[PDB]
């Protein structure tokens, strides 16, 4: 195990001296921002306190060296600079964490990447996206398997730029700028125009938890009144979605390739079978089997 570490410094050509630092970098300010409160006071990032406490002790060291302070103070100060820099990189790693106001351990640079709130899992493996929505789901027996019903007010905001384009083409609005004021004010012209836009434009429905890939399927949206999403009764098994207050999210594919991926790969009619067992899922399941 020692060779595993030593041979790494041998071949690569980097010196082991890098594990000892002579200078520490300062993270850009927008990544450690200081925000103002509605009461006039200020709230800052923990890193500014951590960086600030390192600077205070580093500036004190320059005083002690210049002043020729006793070797006990210079040595006992360097340790504090070591413990302070140890907190900047990974507070709490050694010993007791640097407590903030309220005996709360301050976040360190390494805490920015760990676990569900770290940069990797929270902001890289999953972002949060534009052109999306969510609402209550309601069963729609009349719907075909490839159909879903989204509320008019949901589709309007999702297709807002598409509606603005067509409102300005058909000369309902003078310019694209005024086309936006028409949708924001919900002028009656958009509801007839919106149908041309959403025509055969599939959308994706998602219900968490997304356990398997059949947790997301593509549908052809159908403008419905009301504010709930209308779901086909046969896809309830795949989503494992009952109707006692469940919510689903809607995502609008934009690019031509994205529409093709939803139309062919993710359309609900092309995913009748369970990928795990090969037995059907979109089949008569509850009331339907009793009737038969």
């Amino acid at each position: 195990k020692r060779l595993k570490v030593v041979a790494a410094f041998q071949q690569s050509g980097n010196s082991p001296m890098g594990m000892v630092l002579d200078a520490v970098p300062v993270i850009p300010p927008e990544l450690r921002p200081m925000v103002q409160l509605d009461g006039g006071r200020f709230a800052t990032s923990d890193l500014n306190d951590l960086y600030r406490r390192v600077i205070n002790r580093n500036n004190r060291l320059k005083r002690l060296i210049d002043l020729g302070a006793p070797e006990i103070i210079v040595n006992n100060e360097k340790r504090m600079l070591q413990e302070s820099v140890d907190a900047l990189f990974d507070n709490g790693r050694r010993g007791r964490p640097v407590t903030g106001p309220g005996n709360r351990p301050l976040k360190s640079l390494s805490d920015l990447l760990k676990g569900k709130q770290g940069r990797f899992r929270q902001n890289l493996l999953g972002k949060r996206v534009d052109y999306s929505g969510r609402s209550v789901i309601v069963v729609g027996p009349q719907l075909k398997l490839h159909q879903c019903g989204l509320p008019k007010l949901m589709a309007l905001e999702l297709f807002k730029p598409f509606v603005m384009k067509r409102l300005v083409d058909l000369n309902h609005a003078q310019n694209i700028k005024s086309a936006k004021r028409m949708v924001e004010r919900q002028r009656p012209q958009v509801w007839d125009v919106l149908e041309e836009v959403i025509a055969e434009h599939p959308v994706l429905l998602n219900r968490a938890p997304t356990l398997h890939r059949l947790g997301i399927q593509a549908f052809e949206p159908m403008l419905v009144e009301g504010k709930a999403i209308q779901l086909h009764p046969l896809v309830c098994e795949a989503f494992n979605a009952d109707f006692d207050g469940d919510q689903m999210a809607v995502h609008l594919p934009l690019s031509a390739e994205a529409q093709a991926e939803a139309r062919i790969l993710m359309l609900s009619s092309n995913n009748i079978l369970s990928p795990a067992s090969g037995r059907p899922l979109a089949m008569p399941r509850l009331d339907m089997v009793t009737g038969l």
Partner: protein, 1114 residues
């Protein structure tokens, strides 16, 4: 009759057991705790008749522990006494409006005793604004009603634990002596058969090190613990010996880095455990130790401190338990069993309520001032010092503000409906300071404990991550001055039930055996059967002779919570659906008009009255003048009280709290009678929903698995219509380039949008405002150096910007109220604000597709379709049903209560008449005579675990009253023949038909619908915001990205993570490409990934992107 005490409607109960004790004040948990804290005359008289000797209020106990204050010499002394309150600063409703705190000024009497001059100056010192409790048990912090929740904490005392080792597979044992304050001390036996002790989390010292520090010789130690080889081996394996040697060993491990003096360690080792300064077991902590060890079992609780005798007897108790002993008597003490404690038993799990929780925060504030006092004493002169000069009340007011402002126990009050508020004031929370962390709660703290009987409800508990950590206080339960929860029981003398009622704690209850409430009892009191169901110690249930029963339960519903006692036919619903049934009643929405349920439980009256959202007359009298605005009562003596109705008030959760008078002009009203009822109330009963004509049948798939179909009659007649009110707010501040001004004059805004505004820019009362409409016109001046080149050219080719208050997306209603605060007009705003406007918008929400309805049995569902009144399957006489519930989602959940409720509901709607001729039939022999006949729309009671039996229910269906035409519509089975309104052909088979109480839950699509094209983005990560209120987008999480990869939709995945999210240039070119009709451009690099590289660099890691050639690219 049911609830014949205040003058309520006559609700008839199917009760077979009499109620010996009527329900106490359901709000007493908050009241008695706060009255004890301030020593109100009501609390003192309560402790007076309780038998108490020298009771102490909450303030008096903190002041006595503090008095007196002396320096190191003792020449100067300060003391406090007699705390009193002046009248309240501002009334309750005025505080909510002006965003201040409900408080009363606190006065104490302090005097300065000077030892070197022999003269004392005593005077009155104002201590601070003291937050006061409303009559409803709530506090008002900065205009928001809050509720201080009772906390379950580990009781002080001595506790023993038997742990099992992992590697050596031997039984280990440990002891903890948990004080009410100070340092901790835990002994343990490691796997080497040696005994040690950890002092305040510190290193584990041998148990003899403590004995040597106290002055005990090594021989006398062998004299006491010689019977065990594990203690003999401890003194042998010991490192240092000597009284002055182990005493320094403790000092350098307890306070390292300091010079060890023989008297600097002798001082703290006496102060940390035997001086009342830094250690104290409360009067309950001393009593809990005196039983476990069996010492001072007769002494009055006067020693508030640990003694060396306790430590020795404690170590003797531990060492015997390790080697199998089961009995021990302390030298000079009574015999006591040797066992381990539960720490979950409600005798070792203590409940501290508002007064105790506040006392600790006052105690911290006083101690912070005490240290300032001792320093200010030795600084000022010893003759011009007054109590005003020694007292700095800054840390005191900052301590109660810190608590109510920031505390896991000061919780935003639940105010959906009165039941939701009442339950919140009776909550028992295990989380919080001094308790435990949520990550520190195993599957054992959460499950039901046998000691919860009659104390904490085993049903009402959240099902989320807080399951088991939050309970509701049982109905008859109460809290003793010690902190434990008492519940009443009926003392059985000699196989005879007595009306003598005594409250027993958890451990007090185990020392006896109690019979179940529904035991057959003679009219004199003797049990009918020799064998009766009896609960025994350690949660053991078994039959036992009638001559063994010592006590028995007061009422059948003794074990449930207030909300649970409101579930009819509760004995037929599983705990799972019952939990949801009780948890969803607290989510009920106040309807426009309220109807009391036909099928009730009897709790509906006291739950509504004790909630405090109705108007009860304090003293008897007659109604002199009654208006929709106020009610004036002329008493018999001659005085007048006028009660003002709360009309269209915004609740904490947007529901409508609206009180309406019930009595009329010149109506004789007794004391304690409901003269006006508020939301979810009818004649004084909780009306959380409506009585709906239900049919249990599948209908064309619209009700498929738990969806609900409703008749449009509920829309046309506002049967399920509810009022919701939103508060909108904006302020005018001082900016860097001037000051924001609120004006009707807004740049580049038409006169048509501004047509509804007054001359100030404020919407006028009564205007209907859609989303996006302007409510308050505010413009802020923007500097020239902040202008876009196009914005500057557009400004050149043609200094304030628009910051008007607009209506958020999804809001709509009538503007009902405006409140304006101006610094110019004496209005005290935060520094930097000149004017503040709040606009109240009220919406009338009819029932819509997707709104969530539910019953009392966890039977929930959304509205899938609202058919017209003619499409609904209608009964034989033409009356169409109101709601259709799918049958498949009924027998799985095991919630038969809805079936029994549906049947009884119909019998209540139609009425019945039992054949009295030829005697009383054999099934109704147990029914009271008041039930043999019932008129239509009769009110009935099915008490929990009592009430209607299935045999009696079957008989009522046989004698259901006929309709107005003389026809009986439902069969004895309870089903009826329905006609399909769409085709006309009658349905082939009879269908269960009846009336069920359905509540409209606070989960409406009008609030939960959301959609976003673009909007705000987080500055750091450049990803879209979250939440509907911020106009955010949905989160394509990790599992959802696996779904795209599973589909192989690579381009969709890149689109999601690039142009649709954090591509700074890619998202804009998509927006441009859409309005141009061009194709979607190529996605760029996520700005969030750029941040990642810059974060790895900040950790001294050199990350670089290399091209195909090998050159690093920037």
């Amino acid at each position: 009759s049911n609830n014949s005490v205040p003058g309520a409607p006559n609700r008839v109960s199917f009760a077979k057991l009499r109620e010996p004790l009527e329900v106490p004040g359901l709000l007493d948990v908050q009241t008695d705790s706060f009255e004890w804290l301030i020593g109100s005359p009501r609390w003192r008289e309560s402790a007076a008749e309780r038998g108490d000797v020298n009771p102490v209020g909450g303030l008096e106990e903190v002041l006595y522990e503090l008095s007196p204050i002396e320096d190191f010499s003792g020449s100067m002394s300060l003391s406090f006494s007699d705390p009193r309150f002046d009248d309240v600063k501002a009334p309750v409703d005025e505080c909510k409006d002006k965003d201040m705190t409900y408080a009363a000024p606190l006065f104490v009497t302090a005097e300065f005793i000077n030892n070197n001059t022999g003269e004392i100056k005593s005077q009155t010192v104002f201590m601070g604004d003291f937050p006061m409790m409303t009559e409803k048990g709530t506090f008002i912090i900065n205009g928001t009603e809050r509720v201080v929740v009772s906390q379950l904490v580990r009781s002080p005392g001595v506790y023993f634990d038997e742990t099992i080792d992992k590697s050596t597979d031997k039984t280990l044992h440990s002891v903890k002596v948990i004080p009410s304050r100070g340092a901790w001390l835990e002994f343990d036996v490691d796997k080497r058969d040696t005994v040690g002790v950890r002092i305040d989390r510190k290193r584990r010292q041998p148990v003899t090190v403590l004995l040597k520090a106290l002055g005990w010789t090594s021989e006398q130690i062998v004299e006491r613990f010689g019977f065990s080889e594990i203690m003999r081996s401890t003194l042998e394996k010991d490192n240092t010996v000597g009284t002055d040697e182990a005493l320094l060993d403790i000092y350098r491990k307890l306070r390292p880095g300091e010079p060890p003096t023989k008297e600097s360690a002798q001082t703290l080792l006496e102060n940390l455990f035997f001086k009342e300064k830094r250690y104290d077991l409360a009067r309950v902590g001393r009593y809990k130790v005196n039983k476990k060890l069996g010492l001072h079992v007769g002494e009055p609780i006067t020693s508030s401190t640990l003694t060396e005798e306790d430590v020795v007897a404690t170590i003797e108790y531990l060492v015997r338990l390790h080697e199998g002993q089961t009995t021990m008597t302390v030298p000079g003490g009574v015999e006591v069993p040797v066992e381990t404690d539960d720490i979950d038993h409600f005798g070792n799990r203590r409940l501290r309520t508002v007064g105790e929780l506040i006392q600790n925060q006052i105690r911290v504030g006083m101690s912070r001032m005490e240290r300032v006092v001792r320093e200010r004493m030795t600084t000022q002169d010893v003759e011009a010092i007054t109590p005003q000069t020694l007292i700095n009340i800054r840390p005191v007011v900052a301590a109660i503000k810190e608590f109510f402002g920031t505390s896991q126990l000061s919780q935003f009050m639940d105010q959906n409906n009165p039941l939701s508020g009442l339950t919140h004031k009776r909550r028992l929370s295990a989380l919080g300071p001094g308790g435990l962390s949520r990550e520190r709660a195993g599957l054992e703290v959460r499950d039901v404990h046998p000691s919860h009987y009659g104390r904490m409800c085993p049903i009402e508990t959240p099902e989320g991550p807080n399951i088991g950590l939050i309970g509701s206080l049982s109905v008859y339960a109460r809290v003793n001055p010690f902190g434990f929860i008492e519940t009443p029981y009926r003392k059985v003398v000699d196989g005879v039930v007595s009306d003598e009622i005594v409250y027993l704690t958890a451990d007090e209850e185990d020392r006896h055996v109690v019979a179940q409430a529904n035991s057959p009892i003679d009219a004199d009191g003797r049990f009918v059967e020799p064998r009766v169901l009896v609960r025994r110690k350690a949660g053991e249930v078994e039959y036992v002779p009638s001559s063994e029963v010592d006590y028995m339960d007061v009422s059948p519903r003794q074990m449930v919570s207030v909300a649970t006692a409101m579930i009819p036919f509760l004995e037929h619903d599983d705990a799972n659906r019952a939990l949801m049934g009780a948890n969803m009643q607290r989510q009920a929405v106040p309807l426009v008009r309220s109807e009391a349920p036909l099928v009730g439980t009897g709790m509906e009256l006291r739950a509504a009255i004790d909630a405090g959202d109705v108007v009860v007359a304090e003293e008897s009298g007659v109604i002199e003048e009654v208006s929709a605005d106020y009610i004036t009562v002329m008493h018999d003596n001659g005085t007048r009280r006028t009660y003002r109705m709360r009309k269209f008030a915004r609740s904490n959760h947007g529901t409508c709290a609206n009180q309406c008078p019930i009595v009329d002009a010149g109506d004789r009203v007794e004391a304690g009678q409901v003269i006006a009822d508020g939301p979810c109330t009818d004649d004084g009963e909780m009306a959380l929903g409506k009585n709906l004509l239900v049919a249990i049948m599948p209908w064309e798939g619209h009700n498929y698995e738990d969806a609900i179909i409703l008749s449009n009659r509920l829309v046309e007649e506002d049967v399920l219509t509810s009022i919701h009110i939103e508060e909108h707010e904006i302020d005018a501040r001082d900016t860097k380039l001037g000051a924001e001004e609120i004006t009707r004059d807004i740049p580049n805004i038409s006169d048509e949008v501004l047509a509804d505004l007054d001359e100030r820019g404020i919407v006028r009362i009564g205007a209907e405002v859609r989303d996006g409409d302007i409510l308050v016109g505010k413009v802020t001046p923007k500097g020239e150096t902040e202008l876009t080149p196009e914005e500057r050219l557009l400004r050149a080719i043609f200094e304030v910007r628009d910051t008007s208050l607009k209506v958020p997306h999804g809001e709509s209603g009538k503007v009902i109220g405006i409140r304006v605060f101006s610094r110019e007009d004496e209005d005290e705003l935060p520094a930097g604000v000149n004017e503040l406007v709040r606009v109240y918008v009220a919406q009338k929400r009819k029932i819509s597709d997707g709104d969530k309805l539910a019953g009392r049995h966890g039977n929930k569902g959304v509205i899938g379709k609202i058919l017209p009144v003619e499409d609904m399957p209608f009964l034989a006489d033409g009356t169409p049903v109101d709601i259709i519930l799918n049958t498949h989602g009924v027998p799985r959940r095991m919630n038969i209560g809805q079936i029994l409720e549906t049947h009884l509901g119909w019998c209540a709607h139609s009425g019945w008449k039992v054949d009295a001729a030829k005697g009383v039939p054999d099934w109704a022999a147990r029914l009271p005579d008041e039930l043999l006949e019932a008129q239509p729309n009769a009110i009935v009671s099915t008490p929990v675990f009592d009430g209607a039996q299935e045999a009696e229910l079957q008989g009522l269906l046989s004698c259901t009253l006929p309709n107005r035409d003389g026809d009986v519509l439902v069969d004895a089975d309870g089903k009826a023949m329905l006609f399909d309104g769409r085709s006309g052909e009658p349905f082939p088979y009879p269908v269960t038909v009846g009336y069920m109480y359905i509540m409209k839950l606070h989960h409406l699509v009008d609030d939960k619908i959301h959609a976003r094209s673009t909007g705000p983005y987080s500055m750091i990560t450049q990803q879209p915001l979250g939440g509907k209120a911020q106009f955010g987008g949905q989160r394509f999480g990790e599992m959802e990205c696996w779904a795209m990869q599973a589909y192989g939709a690579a381009y969709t995945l890149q689109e999601l993570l690039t142009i649709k999210s954090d591509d700074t240039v890619g998202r804009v070119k998509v927006y441009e490409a859409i309005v141009k009709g061009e194709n979607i451009p190529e996605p760029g690099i996520p700005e969030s990934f750029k941040v990642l590289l810059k974060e790895l660099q900040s950790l001294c890691l050199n990350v670089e992107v290399l091209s195909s050639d090998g050159a690093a690219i920037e």
